């Protein structure tokens, strides 16, 4: 996260860290959506141009974390994966269309002050809140600047949703209805973005209708980070909710 600040304790209790056991590495962010399901970006699991194609046995998730590198005993919970499900129409060859994956935990996790699931939006919440100029919130342990600069604790930044024609005109990459972008325009007098290491983390919004937090997006891709006239791109969660439902209902 670029131009963010330190999260407060328990501020994002749905934040999940995808972690490589050996050699030990933070891989990506993710989000807790129930006691047994975690949502992430498809490219955090499958990206053949980078020789990346993880199996379940390949990764761990770390839930309830704040420190990037400390083992937060009695606070964080570490879980093994039972199965990974990647969207069958995930477009890794081109533009990362449908950059979404689900991970089933081997055992349900216990909730605490630090561990608590986010809501996924219903059709009406998604239509109401996904509007240009409203702000959502992105969190992660990714790079602090375009370049190795890495935070000591979870970072947060709030960013406005950008109108689709501005998202489109900002990039030569083909954008789709399964994506949205967020960030300040040049001349809006504020900055901020997600960055490398933040993918799979949640773009969330607080409902004024019921005070609940909803995950509208998944950090997916960009062109550099926090550049003037560029915007962060996020997987459109609600647009892909029929798939999430299909997977969870079948396992």
């Amino acid at each position: 996260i670029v131009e963010g600040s330190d999260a407060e304790i328990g501020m994002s209790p749905w934040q999940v860290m995808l972690f490589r056991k050996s050699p030990q590495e933070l891989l990506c962010g993710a989000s807790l959506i129930s006691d047994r399901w975690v949502l992430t970006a498809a490219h955090c699991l499958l990206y053949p141009p980078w020789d990346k194609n993880f199996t379940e046995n390949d990764l761990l998730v770390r839930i309830g974390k704040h420190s990037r590198t400390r083992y937060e005993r009695n606070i964080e919970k570490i879980s093994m994966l039972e199965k990974i499900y990647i969207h069958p129409r995930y477009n890794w060859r081109e533009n990362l269309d449908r950059d979404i994956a689900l991970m089933k935990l081997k055992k349900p996790v216990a909730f605490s002050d630090y561990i608590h699931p986010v809501c996924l939006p219903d059709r009406e919440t998604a239509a109401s809140l996904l509007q240009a100029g409203y702000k959502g919130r992105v969190t992660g342990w990714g790079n602090l600047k375009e370049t190795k600069g890495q935070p000591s604790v979870l970072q947060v930044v709030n960013l406005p949703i950008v109108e689709r024609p501005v998202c489109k005109d900002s990039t030569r990459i083909r954008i789709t209805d399964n994506m949205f972008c967020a960030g300040y325009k040049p001349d809006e007098g504020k900055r901020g973005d997600a960055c490398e290491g933040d993918a799979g983390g949640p773009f969330v919004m607080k409902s004024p209708f019921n005070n609940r937090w909803y995950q509208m997006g998944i950090v997916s891709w960009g062109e550099g980070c926090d550049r003037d006239g560029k915007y962060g791109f996020y997987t459109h969660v609600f647009r892909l909710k029929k798939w999430i439902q299909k997977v969870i209902d079948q396992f």
Binding site: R20, Q24, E25, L26, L27, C28, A41, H43, C44, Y47, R62, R68, T69, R70, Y71, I78, E94, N95, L96, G142, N143, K148, G149, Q150, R172, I173, R174, A194, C195, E196, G197, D198, A199, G200, V219, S220, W221, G222, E223, G224, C225
Partner: peptide, 25 residues
């Protein structure tokens, strides 16, 4: 039509150098 500059948002490191603290067993 060009994805030449597309930067998927995950890459990684142990920034202090060589270290996350161990966990589990």
């Amino acid at each position: 039509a060009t994805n030449a500059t597309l930067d998927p948002r995950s890459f990684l490191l142990r920034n202090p150098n060589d270290k996350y603290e161990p966990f589990w067993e």
